[PDB]
Symmetry: C3
Subunit: 597 residues, 3 copies
């Protein structure tokens, strides 16, 4: 009768054990010690309790769910998905996750240690799915929370390579739901056509959710795929750190973004991106303001490495009928980003920062301010016409650039004949270094092309570090752009031979509170008088000039033009030079024109 017990499933519960023969240790049974761990093998069995080998013809979903449900009932634990095996999923889950096209329901305090591989079976080909779902209701607004759920290990989630069947479908790897202290660490997500790999939170509900040391490889593969963002961070106090993102499909270059940060106190740091269209969206959607309020603040994008084809960071905020989204207190620092090799205009417009209009294309709903962009490097190959430090395409209430290195076609850009952004508090510090890769490519183009409705309380301190005589101007304001309470300067270095430096097509530099300086060539003529003698400009376009000074040597012995000039009411410049010998003098001089500076 003892033999029967020992060979029964209660057998281990009759074999005694004491840790290391320590007489001070608990007198236990072997089953107690084995019960301290749990794996999928403990649930991957047929109705008679016989273990089933996983494989492409076995659907492991019900067994994994049984494991999760059971461990949940004991207050949690960690289930191991064993190494050396591929565990296939081949059906949809039931109940609360069915509304989410869910496969597996995650549960609070039940962690998954994925050491083996989880593969999607062809049941999912051309269909929607979300592999792991933390919602417990079809309607997220009526869902309970997921808490203390961690997925980690050296294993792999493989989406089977299946294309989307229709653009309207959604696909996800891990949707944590209304998620508090949940995380994914170490996992490789690969070989799919999905909308997201991981979503965190739901419309501001959730906290302390993180993606760390994960890899995401080849997760877009078709023209059907409407849009892809690898990680969507939709709860506060959450972020993505030390991850690796790679795409190889041409479609990903037009549709894929690595991360989005959609709630306050979120971050994206220390990650490497290759083959994506975009780096990160940093936005406040009014529609997503329920859980954590209508402000996305304390947003951090730092120390990432990227090769992308479109825009690195996209800023935005928008409104609904009853809620207004605001984006403020953002830092973008220490990133090194390039636009990968491509033809001009062959992917979305290349940019380090984009101020993006809302999903309906509106440029007059945004409330974006207190952004710092500092200590980044950006590069686009010389052929890429559509490359800018910032594409400023919607209303901006402030963005500050200090000590970056931007090596691309444009510094500030917006297309003419499109949006007319209202710009406030745009600061471009003199410590921004403008690279020379695009020198000689800029025929017909303005380095800072200020195609806006208006600019106020802004600073543009242009500093070249090499010549580019191809450009039409360093900075141009069309007559349609109002300019007030602003500082616009062009340093003279490398500008001696430029026909135009700063261009104000509406004469906007004459504004009462516009502070400007830039180089210009000026023709002057003197009076005949021997001795101290006035020189006057021939042209009368300098009524706005407070002072000017020589940027040219004086090749003459018998006279010298003035070193410095002021203006007169008729718009001439005037200064006092010296005629060692008398005579009317005529000179053409390069001057630094100054207004209130």
């Amino acid at each position: 009768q003892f033999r029967a017990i020992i060979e029964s499933p209660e057998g281990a519960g009759h074999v005694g054990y004491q840790y290391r023969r320590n007489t001070g240790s608990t007198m236990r049974m072997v089953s107690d010690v084995l019960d301290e761990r749990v794996s999928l093998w403990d649930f991957h069995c047929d109705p008679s309790g016989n273990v089933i080998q996983p494989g492409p013809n076995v659907d492991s979903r019900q067994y994994l769910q049984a494991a999760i449900d059971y461990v949940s009932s004991n207050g949690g634990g960690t289930i191991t998905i064993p190494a050396g095996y591929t565990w296939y999923l081949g059906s949809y889950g039931v109940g609360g996750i069915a509304g989410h096209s869910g496969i597996i329901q995650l549960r609070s305090n039940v962690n998954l240690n994925i050491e083996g591989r989880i593969h999607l079976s062809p049941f999912f080909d051309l269909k929607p799915f979300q592999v792991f779902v933390g919602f417990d209701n079809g309607d997220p607004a009526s869902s309970g929370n997921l808490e203390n759920c961690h997925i980690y290990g050296h294993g792999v989630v493989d989406f089977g390579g299946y294309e989307f069947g229709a653009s309207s479908q959604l696909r996800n790897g891990v949707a944590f739901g209304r998620s508090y202290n949940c995380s994914v660490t170490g996992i490789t997500f690969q070989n799919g056509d999905v909308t997201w790999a991981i979503t965190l939170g739901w419309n501001g509900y959730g906290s302390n959710c993180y993606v760390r040391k994960c890899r995401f490889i080849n997760l877009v593969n078709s023209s059907v795929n409407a849009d892809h963002s690898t990680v969507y961070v939709n709860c506060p106090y959450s972020g993505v750190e030390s991850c690796y993102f790679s795409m190889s499909s041409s479609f990903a270059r037009n549709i894929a973004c690595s991360v989005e940060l959609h709630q306050h106190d979120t971050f994206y740091r220390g990650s490497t991106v290759n083959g994506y269209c975009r780096g990160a969206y940093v936005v406040m959607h009014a529609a997503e303001a329920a859980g954590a309020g209508s402000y996305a603040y304390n947003m951090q994008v730092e120390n990432n490495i990227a090769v992308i084809y479109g825009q690195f960071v996209i800023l935005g905020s928008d409104v609904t009928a009853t809620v207004s989204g605001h984006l403020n207190d953002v830092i973008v620092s220490g990133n090194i980003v390039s636009i990968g090799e491509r033809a001009a205009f062959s992917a979305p417009f290349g940019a380090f920062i984009d101020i993006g209009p809302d999903n309906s294309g509106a440029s007059n709903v945004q409330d974006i301010q207190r952004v710092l962009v500092t200590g980044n490097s950006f590069y686009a190959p010389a052929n890429i016409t559509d490359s800018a430090a910032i594409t400023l395409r919607a209303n901006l209430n402030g963005c500050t650039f200090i000590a970056n290195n931007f090596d691309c076609r444009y510094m500030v850009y917006n297309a003419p004949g499109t949006t007319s952004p209202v710009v406030q508090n745009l600061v471009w510090d003199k410590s921004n270094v403008i690279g020379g890769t695009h020198a000689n490519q800029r025929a017909g183009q303005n380095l800072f092309d200020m195609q806006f409705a208006s600019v106020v309380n802004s600073t543009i301190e242009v500093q070249l570090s090499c010549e580019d005589l191809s450009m039409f101007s360093c900075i141009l304001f069309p007559a349609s752009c109002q300019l007030s309470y602003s500082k616009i300067t062009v340093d003279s270095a490398w500008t001696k031979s430029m026909s135009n430096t700063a261009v104000f097509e509406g004469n906007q530099q004459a504004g009462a509170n516009v502070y400007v300086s830039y180089p210009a060539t000026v023709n002057l003529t003197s009076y005949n008088t021997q001795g101290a003698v006035p020189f006057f400009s021939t042209d009368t376009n300098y009524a706005w000039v407070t002072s000017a000074y020589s940027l040219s040597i004086n090749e003459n012995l018998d006279f010298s033009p003035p070193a410095t000039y002021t203006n007169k009411a008729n718009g001439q410049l005037v200064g006092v030079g010296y005629n060692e010998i008398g005579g009317v003098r005529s000179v053409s001089v390069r001057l630094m024109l100054q207004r209130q500076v």
Copy 2:
């Protein structure tokens, strides 16, 4: 007789096992394999060896200690604190940790994998405690070391919500002691009223101690609590990375600091703080110099996100009778910090950097230098009068600010009628961007309020990015502040309408080695002479001016004032203008006054 063996505690030691039926594998017994792991269950038993269920009426302390002591005796290992259970602690420990109000003694090479919850029982209500202590003696100076002790997992240390019983009491979570290669990873510390959560090292003794991916939630809850700093780093080559700190109590806004760094080669990176008074102290206490010397150098505070109510980083050093503390080689970079919503003066003075007097209030003991503050963003709401980029309240031997974005009431501040710091090597680079949130709030106030005993070898390059005509001045030096061998400039942008820009109440700008430029309005009158004609200032307050130039347009046709001016011995300005027609001229002009620049 076999049956009896099998059911005995030696039973598992008689059941044979060979790994995966591999004939090349060791012929072992089941007990050998089970002996490869160890958990609290192996020691959580009564004197007859019967397992005891944990719970609020069970004190688990002796069992956990027995586990640690035993594993220590075998050269170490990792003890699991099982998931799905709350393990309560309800008594003090004995021996060497009793002097520290210790509960559990940590031991070298014995790691704790906390997957479940550790809770303090109400025995500890109103009492001191340190939950885990690595010292082995009541007197730390006679304590051995703790080495290779790691605490990690998804579990929780809960301090039971109990208030301090008296302000003089101390409470701690983990005190590693004289600690070498010790760490805490993943753990949540919550629900208390404590002095610290984690301390590392002891007075410079220790090395390579780290806190990573931990959460600290609601660890101050009473008015009795004297002071709280979540992590106190008191050994070199140690730090805090990727942690989350949150407080909700009003008291924490006045008393709580997230981290202190007190020894060389220490760091605080990539963390998020909410609801605290302070971010980090970075200090060298002479009293703590025994283990690692009297210099705190290589101190790093980077890439943190914070909402705080007082000061973000506090710098300091101090002395004892025989030892002098020095703080140097510090970097504060990439942080994004705001003062949270509060009334002016309702918490300690808001600051990004504070130069803090010693614990006795002395401002003349410090030796702080070679600090770099770069690429940070700081914001305080417009109502918060008590907000500064730096509150400079004690002697400073150097601090360098480059390429930050500071959006608060003051840039440099110290209160008048308090300390008179001696300031050396304060560098404020022109690349620091001054935000506009507090525009129009600054009536009676100086943006840079230089309330110091003296300033030497310093640079203040003031650059506005919007108008604020409410401020009394951009920078003011009271007559009591000596100023020498320094550069002080105010860029003209947004200053045209300011009555005062730079103010030197002791005429300190006249110093031999003071280099200054700022805008001013000057009245001039010319001689009557037709032709080249001198203009002279009516006032005689410009004996210090080396050159000046026009910041105003000339509304006249018949004459022009000089574009540039020098001075005369009587303190008038003088320049040569031009009278097309003769006559005495009188003008009021905005000039850039320059001295040696």
Copy 3:
């Protein structure tokens, strides 16, 4: 007969188990559950299957290899190296790793959890070795890959303290080989004389290899050791993060480097270094271009803390007969670095950045560009003559410095009579702060010593923050250095008493596209005329000057020199001053000389 089965090695395979008595769980045997884990104990046995205790007289190599080989055959898993034991290695491995002096062969998907200690036995004294090798062939070009191999834990690899027997020998800890998704985490490598601790990849072959939270302690100890670099990163999309490196040997101060990055998309972040010669090499060796191409781009060195004796980051690229290496798109940011206490010239030349000639000493093979060095702090003690922000010793095609704090002897340096680098696109922004530690030490020395063949498209904006009248000049160009299309400025602050500020020994500032300004003292004399009167320089060395302005006060009542000056064809300066009373005037004035700026 049952008893015999139970005591046999198949015994555990006859004892039934069901998880937690769950009737829905798999009916398993105890051996199935034990088979879910594996340790070295399962293979550390004699030929009769009896377990062998590890120790200094036991060679564990064959047993560890048997474990790896076996687990490999089942598609992988994790082998534990148990805590509380030291496992000695005392022989070389056989087959494919013998060509690499290999001890253990790593295999794909077979992870090692090192909790105990692995020690080298004295068999290896004075011999070469590589402890863990991922190559499967003696010739790497014919080797298969290593994939999904992770080494982690709290354990230790100890190299036994043995010195190298000959300089030509190689020693390594982990050579992952042609390595894809491999990593080392948590491990301490200590007590050796080795070439490397860890190498990643092979000549560009490999991907996603990482070293995280590892310690490296005392890995150089002899004069025989030819060269040491702790981690050599030789595959793309790979890096080193949050590690600790320490050396105590004098030899390490001359030969040891913490990291090298040799392929694209690699990083070195968040680490602490003490006692090393060098921080990191960042290079493209043409010889290593097979796997990932001939460009090292997207290279990141950030947020490290270092005390070193030579150079922090060394940049380079080189060629073979058929391949040319290129280095571009590099960011060095947020690092805090000092040269440790040492005598001048007692270790390799101290530098933050070094542009290093190739291994044959050639300075004309490099293609280095698009480098950003920003937001770092560097310090060298005042006695260390051989300390520079950059030692620019080979051809440079671009490097940009913004918003750093450099406190050392030289800013830009190269030795005269050595290499004559061709320099292009060197940008030194005005936001770089120059510390004062070396003030008064610079007799005979130029702060920026431009000992190059030529300089083009470069910017040097010199800004002092304290006086140093000991220096010969702020910046000097020898006559042998061509200078064109460049901007060179010296801010006047702290320069009033300097005899020389900028020195152009070949009069190179006269170039058509050279833009310069610096202070100078100039003697002038006026004509006798009462009224507006010309002042002329006595010297004729200013044919290149476009304008000049006064940096001196005018101590006179009866006259004033000109505020501003231009030049004449004979090289005199000329300006119009004012004689209230007539008379020839003679003055010596400090002027800001300007050319095209």
